[PDB]
Amino acid sequence: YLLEQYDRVEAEEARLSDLITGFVDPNAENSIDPELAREKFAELRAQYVVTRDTIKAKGRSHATAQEEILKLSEVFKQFRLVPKQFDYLVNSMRVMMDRVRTQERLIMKLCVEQCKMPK
């Protein structure tokens, strides 16, 4: 996720070019200096490290675990979308689903054509 891409671009100590200009960038409702980004990219890390622990808190769908889900979301919903790089983040779903989906189809290709089955 965006924290990963922001460290990958910060892998070699430096960048202020366009690919950061897409990133988090809260508009006060545009080159980005280090300290501002390092701050905006930090309380998100805090929401993660305090969020990923409650996923197991008596289930994926626990009250306060969903509170940290919805709160991480609300933490993001003040912010805006991030650049065409984020395209691959969506692809990382499709290329999974494209595969997963396909396997179901494949299983059906193995289950549904030769023998009879109910529908």
Partner 1 sequence: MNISDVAKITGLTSKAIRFYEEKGLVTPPMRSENGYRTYTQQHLNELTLLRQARQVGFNLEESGELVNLFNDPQRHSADVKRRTLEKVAEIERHIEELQSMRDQLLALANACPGDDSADCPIIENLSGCC
- Comparison of 14 and 81: residue with beta carbon closer to partner 1: 14
> Quick one: which of 1, 7, 8, 18 contacts partner 1 (CB under 8 A)?
18
Residues 84, 86, 87, CA angle at the centre, nearest 5°? 70
Extended beta strands in 4-101, E state: none
Residue 17 touching partner 1 (CB under 8 A): yes
State yes or no: residue 34 binds partner 1 (CB under 8 A): no
Site membership for partner 1, residue 19 (CB under 8 A): yes
- Give the residue with the Cβ less far from partner 1, 7 or 18: 18
Nearer to partner 1, 88 or 97 (CB): 88
Buried b (16+ CB within 10 A) or exposed e, 28-50: eeeebeeeebeebbeebeebeee
Under the rule (CB under 8 A), what is the footprint of partner 1?
Answer: 14-19
